[PDB]
Amino acid sequence: NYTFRCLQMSSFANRSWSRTDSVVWLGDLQTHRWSNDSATISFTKPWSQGKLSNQQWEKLQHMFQVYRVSFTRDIQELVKMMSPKEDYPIEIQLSAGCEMYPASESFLHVAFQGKYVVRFWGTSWQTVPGAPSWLDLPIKVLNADQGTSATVQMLLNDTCPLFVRGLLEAGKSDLEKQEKPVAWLSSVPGHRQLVCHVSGFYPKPVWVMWMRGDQEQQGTHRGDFLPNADETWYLQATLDVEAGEEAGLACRVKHSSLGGQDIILYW
Amino acid sequence: QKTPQIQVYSRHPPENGKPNILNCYVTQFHPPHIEIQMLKNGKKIPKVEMSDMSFSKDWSFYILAHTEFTPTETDTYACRVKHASMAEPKTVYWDRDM
Ligand SMILES: *[C@@H]1O[C@H](CO[C@@H]2O[C@@H](C)[C@@H](O)[C@@H](O)[C@@H]2O)[C@@H](O[C@@H]2O[C@H](CO)[C@@H](O[C@@H]3O[C@H](CO[C@H]4O[C@H](CO)[C@@H](O)[C@H](O)[C@@H]4O)[C@@H](O)[C@H](O[C@H]4O[C@H](CO)[C@@H](O)[C@H](O)[C@@H]4O)[C@@H]3O)[C@H](O)[C@H]2NC(C)=O)[C@H](O)[C@H]1NC(C)=O
Ligand SMILES: CCCCCCCCCNC(=O)CCC[C@@H](O)[C@@H](O)[C@H](CO[C@H]1O[C@H](CO)[C@H](O)[C@H](O)[C@H]1O)NC(=O)CCCCCCC
Ligand SMILES: *[C@@H]1O[C@H](CO)[C@@H](O[C@@H]2O[C@H](CO)[C@@H](O)[C@H](O)[C@H]2NC(C)=O)[C@H](O)[C@H]1NC(C)=O
Ligand SMILES: CCCCCCCCCCCCCCCC(=O)O
Ligand SMILES: *[C@@H]1O[C@H](CO)[C@@H](O)[C@H](O)[C@H]1NC(C)=O
């Protein structure tokens, strides 16, 4: 299960100012960046082009170049038509791509001021239950544009799975990279709070538990997965204990990279 | 509008005198316009690298700031965030363990 996400962020400030920026993620590795500043889509990996030839990529790029200008014009023009009722500032987000399987499903979701309002599904755009009613008319209009509907359907149903299978092949060693965790212990200097820190692991799946001998200490609170800047992950697991009960405790780590040789830090 | 949560943690075990990387991960904010600085002894650190802004399944934004640092027992490190959701800048000092 790999999920390809293209994440577009548009800020509209007043009528004379807007930017659109995008990032693309294959699973948890960033594959592309597309700044407002740049005319072209930038690569964040050597394999970011997938199996697409230089011409095939340019054709896809052009289509997105056309889309970005058109999308900006359309949103600017919609705001003028709705003024003063709907007015600046405005934030629009699009999350679009496909989730691969052993087969794939595609999605295109749109949020307005941080709330999900619109998706493309089947052959048409649609507002979602609870969306502001003023979106219904603009979406009907958009649904009349047959060519846009047909391009979007091609992009979702065909282009996305084809392109991602290209990325999965082209970036296999990078996608299947194993990076080892390093761990270290600390505590708040009454009952103490022991913290087992685990940083530098990839991929994401991991097991961190406090132990006394072979007994798992089920009071272990697992923190959130925090990213490092080098495409590895950070995680801490804490245990609330009474003072004098810290002797004989240990933090045990299991990860794919370690080849069955767990990390064990005795407190 | 949503308030940014801020987490500060080091890339490697913090050992005094050993160069390292300090991370500031800012999450769960809206709108995306935001100003993030990392501080050494309360002063702005100049070379602070930044990830591209992205967002989560719930549409809230996130971003990762990072800079080289060397921990010692004479230095504090922090992350200060200015954002429209908060009246004044919010600062989180490095826990010293994290
Ligand atoms: C791209 O794939 C689309 C389906 O995939 C989904 O959407 C994409 C964007 C991804 O997100 C993916 O992950 C999703 O799974 C596909 O859309 C389908 O297109 C056909 C038309 O070509 C639609 O068929 C019509 O169905 C309606 C009934 O729809 C309702 O009921 C069904 C349940 O039975 C539900 O599934 C729907 O949600 C609706 O509630 C029929 O009324 C209609 O029949 C009449 O018209 C046809 C002519 O087309 C005649 O042959 C018949 O005899 C009837 O007169 C259609 O059969 C289908 O609903 C639609 N799916 C959805 C989920 O909306 C799209 O066509 C693909 N495009 C390309 C280019 O590949
Ligand atoms: C306020 C919050 C509202 C959010 C809900 C609205 C979201 C609207 C999203 N609209 C779009 O994504 C489409 C915007 C661009 C579109 O409307 C057209 O202007 C543009 C140009 O269309 C014309 O030329 C095309 C050939 O280039 C076609 O032939 C079309 O028939 C013709 O009218 N359309 C496109 O660029 C379509 C391809 C890009 C679609 C990608 C979507 C992510
Ligand atoms: C975001 O990017 C686009 C790049 O095309 C900018 O759009 C241009 O804006 C300038 C204003 O300085 C105009 O001269 C051009 O007419 C615009 N170009 C197009 C193709 O529409 C936009 O200004 C950028 N936004 C920001 C905030 O930098
Ligand atoms: C919209 C669905 C995309 C399906 C095709 C995916 C392969 C092309 C990758 C293009 C990344 C460009 C980033 C811009 C994202 C955007 O503006 O929507
Ligand atoms: C439009 O927005 C920008 C960014 O918010 C602002 O700096 C600028 O003064 C505004 N311009 C006008 C003409 O209102």
XYZ file of C-alpha atoms and ligand atoms in Angstrom:
539
model
C 0.000 0.000 0.000
C 1.653 3.192 -1.315
C -0.335 6.438 -1.456
C 0.611 9.058 -3.997
C -0.523 12.553 -2.961
C -0.195 15.808 -4.854
C -0.911 18.559 -2.307
C -1.750 21.987 -3.800
C -1.986 25.111 -1.592
C -3.429 28.358 -2.960
C -3.574 31.578 -0.918
C -5.625 34.491 -2.332
C -4.946 37.733 -0.391
C -6.854 40.620 -2.104
C -7.232 40.616 -5.995
C -3.655 41.629 -6.849
C -1.902 38.859 -4.819
C -2.127 35.073 -4.867
C 0.308 32.177 -4.896
C -0.085 28.488 -5.593
C 2.485 25.985 -4.321
C 2.496 22.191 -4.485
C 4.383 19.265 -2.997
C 4.108 15.615 -4.057
C 4.593 12.637 -1.722
C 4.975 8.944 -2.572
C 4.138 7.417 0.799
C 6.228 9.483 3.229
C 9.016 10.447 0.782
C 8.649 13.748 -1.034
C 8.944 13.269 -4.796
C 8.218 16.780 -6.167
C 8.054 20.470 -5.294
C 6.310 23.072 -7.402
C 6.846 26.558 -6.152
C 4.792 29.531 -7.301
C 8.143 31.144 -8.272
C 8.950 28.367 -10.776
C 7.473 27.721 -14.226
C 8.511 24.031 -13.989
C 7.905 21.164 -11.579
C 11.103 20.456 -9.598
C 12.371 16.991 -8.673
C 13.253 16.095 -5.067
C 14.542 12.639 -6.113
C 16.710 11.304 -9.005
C 13.726 9.069 -9.975
C 11.003 11.776 -9.744
C 10.269 11.429 -13.489
C 9.223 7.739 -13.096
C 9.262 5.926 -16.470
C 7.960 8.974 -18.366
C 10.149 10.027 -21.301
C 11.370 13.607 -21.526
C 8.577 14.458 -24.007
C 5.810 12.611 -22.061
C 6.839 14.489 -18.906
C 6.800 17.860 -20.686
C 3.246 17.179 -21.962
C 2.073 16.365 -18.456
C 3.954 19.429 -17.125
C 2.325 21.705 -19.745
C -1.119 20.446 -18.754
C -0.399 21.405 -15.127
C 1.120 24.729 -16.291
C -2.144 25.481 -18.124
C -4.208 24.285 -15.135
C -2.412 26.540 -12.631
C -3.016 29.782 -14.576
C -6.637 28.743 -15.383
C -7.375 27.751 -11.791
C -6.038 31.122 -10.528
C -8.096 33.074 -13.086
C -11.247 31.056 -12.289
C -10.958 31.591 -8.516
C -10.185 35.327 -8.973
C -13.205 35.614 -11.280
C -15.536 33.663 -8.948
C -14.605 36.005 -6.072
C -15.457 39.112 -8.147
C -18.834 37.618 -9.121
C -19.651 36.741 -5.490
C -18.413 40.056 -3.996
C -18.983 41.260 -1.358
C -20.548 38.012 0.021
C -17.445 35.846 -0.397
C -14.307 37.872 0.074
C -10.597 37.785 0.868
C -8.502 36.285 2.274
C -9.114 32.792 0.821
C -7.177 29.515 1.189
C -7.832 26.635 -1.208
C -6.222 23.206 -0.843
C -6.385 20.268 -3.231
C -5.311 16.763 -2.308
C -5.213 14.512 -5.364
C -3.651 11.190 -6.331
C -4.028 7.448 -5.969
C -3.570 4.658 -3.417
C -1.848 1.612 -4.925
C -2.716 -1.992 -3.934
C -1.517 -5.563 -4.820
C -5.051 -2.299 -8.492
C -5.710 1.279 -7.271
C -8.257 3.866 -6.087
C -7.948 7.583 -6.925
C -9.129 10.722 -5.139
C -9.445 14.477 -5.643
C -10.514 16.455 -2.575
C -10.856 20.226 -2.241
C -10.887 22.283 0.932
C -11.909 25.944 1.307
C -10.798 27.925 4.379
C -9.584 24.596 5.865
C -12.880 22.697 5.380
C -13.451 19.908 2.844
C -16.141 21.088 0.419
C -15.719 19.511 -3.033
C -14.474 16.344 -4.669
C -14.299 14.804 -8.106
C -16.027 11.395 -8.133
C -16.944 9.256 -11.151
C -17.590 11.641 -14.046
C -18.323 14.932 -12.249
C -17.340 17.390 -9.538
C -19.633 17.522 -6.532
C -20.018 19.477 -3.308
C -20.054 17.345 -0.132
C -22.858 17.323 2.497
C -22.652 20.536 4.576
C -20.712 22.538 1.974
C -21.745 26.199 1.632
C -24.684 26.356 -0.788
C -23.064 29.150 -2.836
C -20.614 26.508 -4.227
C -23.431 24.577 -6.005
C -23.798 27.004 -8.938
C -20.032 27.316 -9.722
C -19.670 23.507 -9.551
C -22.621 22.956 -11.954
C -20.948 25.379 -14.390
C -17.631 23.516 -14.042
C -19.414 20.169 -14.637
C -20.565 21.511 -18.027
C -16.894 21.669 -19.162
C -16.794 18.166 -20.700
C -13.114 18.379 -21.720
C -12.048 19.212 -18.158
C -14.135 16.319 -16.797
C -12.551 13.981 -19.383
C -8.968 15.112 -18.600
C -9.589 14.773 -14.840
C -11.041 11.256 -15.400
C -8.014 10.244 -17.475
C -5.682 11.731 -14.841
C -7.354 9.975 -11.912
C -8.228 6.604 -13.468
C -5.187 6.014 -15.700
C -2.313 8.526 -15.482
C -1.972 8.320 -11.705
C -1.664 4.518 -11.411
C 0.585 4.350 -14.500
C 2.918 7.077 -13.270
C 3.164 5.679 -9.724
C 4.063 2.162 -10.926
C 6.825 4.047 -12.780
C 7.971 5.679 -9.521
C 7.843 2.414 -7.559
C 10.196 0.795 -10.088
C 12.474 3.788 -10.639
C 12.858 4.535 -6.906
C 12.856 0.960 -5.557
C 16.198 1.140 -3.669
C 15.230 4.501 -2.203
C 11.729 3.283 -1.264
C 13.134 0.110 0.307
C 15.999 1.849 2.124
C 16.728 0.661 5.679
C 18.088 3.237 8.147
C 18.908 2.194 11.725
C 17.585 3.875 14.872
C 19.810 5.321 17.550
C 18.296 5.488 21.057
C 19.004 7.298 24.324
C 17.305 7.651 27.699
C 16.431 10.631 29.877
C 14.088 11.723 32.679
C 12.476 14.784 34.292
C 14.869 15.864 37.118
C 7.663 12.184 43.658
C 7.160 9.817 40.711
C 9.658 10.231 37.809
C 8.930 10.128 34.047
C 11.364 8.028 31.985
C 11.773 8.904 28.294
C 13.176 6.520 25.702
C 14.192 8.491 22.580
C 14.473 6.749 19.196
C 15.708 8.699 16.164
C 16.978 7.975 12.636
C 14.927 4.934 11.670
C 13.390 4.246 8.284
C 10.921 2.901 7.250
C 8.160 4.067 9.618
C 7.092 0.743 11.295
C 8.875 0.290 14.636
C 8.386 -1.146 18.147
C 9.506 0.681 21.306
C 8.707 -0.674 24.766
C 9.868 -0.230 28.298
C 10.820 -3.547 29.916
C 11.750 -5.181 33.213
C 13.509 -8.325 32.042
C 11.013 -9.916 29.627
C 7.880 -8.168 31.029
C 6.426 -5.430 28.781
C 5.517 -2.405 30.912
C 2.046 -1.593 29.525
C 2.061 1.927 31.074
C 4.421 2.783 28.155
C 2.987 5.855 26.363
C 4.068 6.008 22.718
C 4.582 9.578 21.415
C 3.826 10.802 17.898
C 6.069 10.022 14.942
C 8.117 13.186 14.312
C 10.073 13.621 11.079
C 13.805 14.313 10.929
C 15.154 16.458 8.066
C 17.079 13.499 6.552
C 13.939 11.447 5.667
C 14.213 9.351 8.861
C 11.798 9.308 11.779
C 11.871 10.262 15.426
C 9.781 8.762 18.223
C 9.855 8.697 22.004
C 8.187 6.314 24.432
C 7.697 7.406 28.056
C 6.891 5.531 31.274
C 5.567 7.065 34.519
C 7.189 5.232 37.486
C 7.731 5.610 41.252
C 11.184 6.659 42.503
C 13.450 3.731 43.436
C 11.606 1.534 40.884
C 13.907 2.598 38.002
C 16.545 -0.071 38.718
C 16.229 -3.027 36.321
C 14.177 -1.074 33.725
C 15.158 -0.944 30.066
C 13.990 0.387 26.709
C 13.826 -2.185 23.922
C 13.708 -1.261 20.220
C 12.879 -3.468 17.245
C 13.248 -2.313 13.654
C 13.639 -3.902 10.197
C 17.105 -2.362 9.733
C 18.581 -4.058 12.836
C 18.367 -7.598 11.424
C 16.919 -9.108 14.626
C 19.552 -7.526 16.899
C 17.347 -5.270 19.037
C 18.579 -2.164 20.829
C 18.356 -2.473 24.616
C 19.209 0.445 26.877
C 19.198 -0.432 30.559
C 18.286 2.609 32.679
C -8.108 29.508 12.558
C -5.944 26.859 14.280
C -3.076 27.316 16.762
C 0.378 25.905 15.906
C 1.706 23.122 18.137
C 5.519 23.178 18.461
C 7.900 20.307 19.177
C 11.662 20.629 19.511
C 13.952 17.573 19.447
C 17.491 16.675 18.394
C 18.480 14.413 15.490
C 21.141 12.485 17.504
C 21.693 11.870 21.250
C 22.476 15.294 22.738
C 26.059 15.053 24.004
C 27.767 18.231 25.193
C 30.465 19.483 22.766
C 29.388 17.215 19.839
C 27.859 18.913 16.770
C 24.259 17.844 16.154
C 20.993 18.956 14.453
C 18.052 20.539 16.296
C 14.552 20.159 14.816
C 11.496 22.333 15.316
C 8.319 20.718 14.004
C 5.338 23.071 13.805
C 1.897 21.470 13.240
C -1.890 21.822 13.274
C -2.051 25.457 12.057
C -4.298 27.478 9.727
C -3.824 29.693 7.778
C -0.409 28.650 6.379
C 1.308 32.052 6.582
C 3.642 31.676 9.543
C 6.994 32.939 10.843
C 9.339 30.501 12.573
C 12.707 31.278 14.152
C 15.104 29.100 16.097
C 16.974 30.761 18.990
C 20.360 30.260 20.707
C 20.407 32.053 24.097
C 17.333 34.022 22.938
C 18.895 35.351 19.694
C 17.912 34.456 16.108
C 20.127 31.740 14.568
C 20.975 32.806 10.980
C 21.177 29.635 8.865
C 17.887 27.824 9.541
C 16.855 25.334 6.860
C 13.141 24.822 6.265
C 11.103 22.060 4.639
C 8.438 22.934 2.074
C 5.116 23.534 3.717
C 2.672 20.654 3.421
C -0.575 19.641 5.090
C -2.147 16.621 6.772
C -5.297 14.528 6.148
C -7.274 17.002 8.311
C -6.095 19.925 6.083
C -3.985 21.498 8.851
C -0.528 22.660 7.778
C 2.879 21.532 8.931
C 6.515 22.428 8.432
C 9.921 21.352 9.753
C 12.664 23.817 10.634
C 16.173 22.627 11.402
C 19.632 23.991 12.172
C 23.042 22.755 13.226
C 23.746 22.984 16.944
C 26.264 21.862 19.550
C 24.741 21.393 22.998
C 26.707 22.607 26.052
C 25.591 23.332 29.627
C 25.994 27.084 29.021
C 23.501 27.359 26.109
C 19.719 27.399 25.663
C 17.932 26.690 22.374
C 14.346 27.472 21.440
C 11.793 27.789 18.654
C 9.652 30.936 18.332
C 6.530 30.974 16.174
C 4.511 34.019 15.114
C 1.073 33.299 13.652
C -2.269 35.113 13.252
C -4.031 32.730 15.686
C -1.879 33.940 18.640
C -1.660 37.481 20.058
C 2.125 37.274 20.720
C 4.966 34.965 19.564
C 4.984 31.506 21.148
C 8.326 30.065 22.165
C 9.262 26.514 23.126
C 12.635 25.997 24.761
C 14.540 22.831 23.969
C 13.758 20.305 26.761
C 17.547 19.504 26.898
C 16.777 15.763 26.767
C 14.791 15.761 23.468
C -13.168 6.832 -14.161
O -13.582 5.965 -13.100
C -14.866 6.318 -12.564
C -15.243 5.415 -11.390
O -14.207 5.398 -10.393
C -14.476 6.298 -9.288
O -14.208 7.677 -9.546
C -12.841 7.979 -9.868
C -12.702 9.479 -10.131
C -11.862 7.524 -8.779
O -11.932 8.404 -7.640
C -12.136 6.072 -8.369
O -11.382 5.723 -7.192
C -13.631 5.866 -8.101
O -13.920 4.501 -7.794
C -15.942 6.233 -13.657
O -17.194 6.734 -13.162
C -18.312 5.919 -13.556
O -18.706 6.236 -14.891
C -19.887 5.591 -15.383
C -20.281 6.252 -16.706
O -19.268 6.037 -17.690
C -21.051 5.693 -14.399
O -22.044 4.748 -14.803
C -23.376 5.273 -14.673
O -23.955 4.849 -13.450
C -25.218 5.465 -13.205
C -25.656 5.061 -11.812
O -24.862 5.801 -10.886
C -25.433 5.731 -9.568
O -25.583 4.401 -9.062
C -24.375 3.649 -8.911
C -24.730 2.339 -8.202
O -25.356 1.409 -9.104
C -23.308 4.412 -8.109
O -22.025 3.825 -8.332
C -23.202 5.894 -8.463
O -22.462 6.566 -7.441
C -24.575 6.543 -8.616
O -25.243 6.635 -7.353
C -26.234 5.016 -14.249
O -27.429 5.802 -14.109
C -25.697 5.133 -15.679
O -26.462 4.229 -16.486
C -27.107 4.862 -17.604
O -26.205 5.473 -18.536
C -25.313 4.587 -19.239
C -24.434 5.413 -20.174
O -23.189 5.701 -19.523
C -26.092 3.493 -19.972
O -25.193 2.539 -20.548
C -26.998 2.778 -18.970
O -27.727 1.716 -19.594
C -27.936 3.786 -18.298
O -28.806 4.419 -19.244
C -24.206 4.791 -15.846
O -23.978 3.380 -16.014
C -20.668 5.380 -12.968
O -21.744 5.711 -12.076
C -19.444 6.181 -12.585
N -19.067 5.794 -11.239
C -19.302 6.551 -10.168
C -18.843 5.949 -8.878
O -19.845 7.646 -10.219
C -15.559 7.030 -14.890
O -16.494 6.757 -15.935
C -14.157 6.649 -15.325
N -13.829 7.403 -16.522
C -12.887 7.009 -17.384
C -12.662 7.870 -18.594
O -12.222 6.002 -17.203
C -14.080 28.645 -3.344
C -13.584 27.216 -3.156
C -14.037 26.609 -4.438
C -13.300 25.291 -4.649
C -14.215 24.482 -5.576
C -13.945 24.919 -6.998
C -12.716 24.177 -7.464
C -12.712 24.491 -8.938
C -11.553 23.686 -9.504
N -11.445 23.948 -10.940
C -10.535 23.308 -11.655
O -9.762 22.488 -11.175
C -10.533 23.636 -13.135
C -9.975 25.032 -13.366
C -9.591 25.202 -14.845
C -10.756 24.902 -15.804
O -11.959 25.493 -15.307
C -10.509 25.461 -17.220
O -10.429 26.887 -17.169
C -9.232 24.891 -17.870
C -9.209 25.248 -19.366
O -10.323 24.592 -19.998
C -10.410 24.704 -21.433
O -9.279 24.120 -22.101
C -9.029 22.725 -21.790
C -7.857 22.340 -22.682
O -6.739 23.010 -22.080
C -10.264 21.827 -22.066
O -10.355 21.485 -23.469
C -11.595 22.487 -21.592
O -12.714 21.809 -22.201
C -11.673 23.992 -21.921
O -12.824 24.570 -21.291
N -9.236 23.423 -17.752
C -8.146 22.671 -17.506
O -7.001 23.116 -17.378
C -8.474 21.183 -17.463
C -7.227 20.341 -17.137
C -6.734 20.520 -15.689
C -7.589 19.789 -14.640
C -6.710 19.453 -13.417
C -7.513 19.538 -12.113
C -6.597 19.299 -10.898
C 2.760 33.558 -8.134
O 3.245 33.185 -9.417
C 2.796 33.854 -10.592
C 3.821 33.495 -11.667
O 3.179 33.463 -12.934
C 2.675 35.366 -10.422
O 1.764 35.841 -11.424
C 2.223 37.052 -12.046
O 2.057 38.174 -11.188
C 2.751 39.329 -11.669
C 2.672 40.441 -10.616
O 3.993 40.819 -10.198
C 2.179 39.771 -13.019
O 3.116 40.663 -13.635
C 1.901 38.615 -13.989
O 0.875 39.030 -14.899
C 1.453 37.308 -13.330
N 1.666 36.202 -14.263
C 0.712 35.352 -14.666
C 1.151 34.290 -15.634
O -0.448 35.414 -14.293
C 2.190 35.765 -9.039
O 2.363 37.174 -8.874
C 2.986 35.041 -7.963
N 2.579 35.474 -6.639
C 3.434 35.864 -5.694
C 2.807 36.280 -4.400
O 4.643 35.889 -5.838
C -4.456 15.421 -10.113
C -4.095 13.949 -10.117
C -2.650 13.757 -10.568
C -2.409 12.440 -11.303
C -1.130 12.470 -12.142
C 0.076 12.339 -11.224
C 1.432 12.378 -11.921
C 1.916 13.789 -12.219
C 2.520 14.486 -11.000
C 2.265 15.986 -11.095
C 2.704 16.753 -9.860
C 2.432 18.246 -10.046
C 2.076 18.966 -8.749
C 0.904 19.936 -8.894
C -0.314 19.452 -8.111
C -1.532 20.283 -8.437
O -1.368 21.497 -8.713
O -2.650 19.712 -8.410
C -2.395 42.621 -1.243
O -1.842 41.631 -0.361
C -0.453 41.732 -0.052
C -0.055 40.517 0.783
O -1.014 40.310 1.823
C -0.238 43.065 0.654
O 1.114 43.195 1.101
C -0.580 44.188 -0.325
O -0.447 45.471 0.299
C -2.008 44.060 -0.853
N -2.152 44.953 -2.001
C -3.210 45.747 -2.226
C -3.134 46.579 -3.479
O -4.180 45.810 -1.487
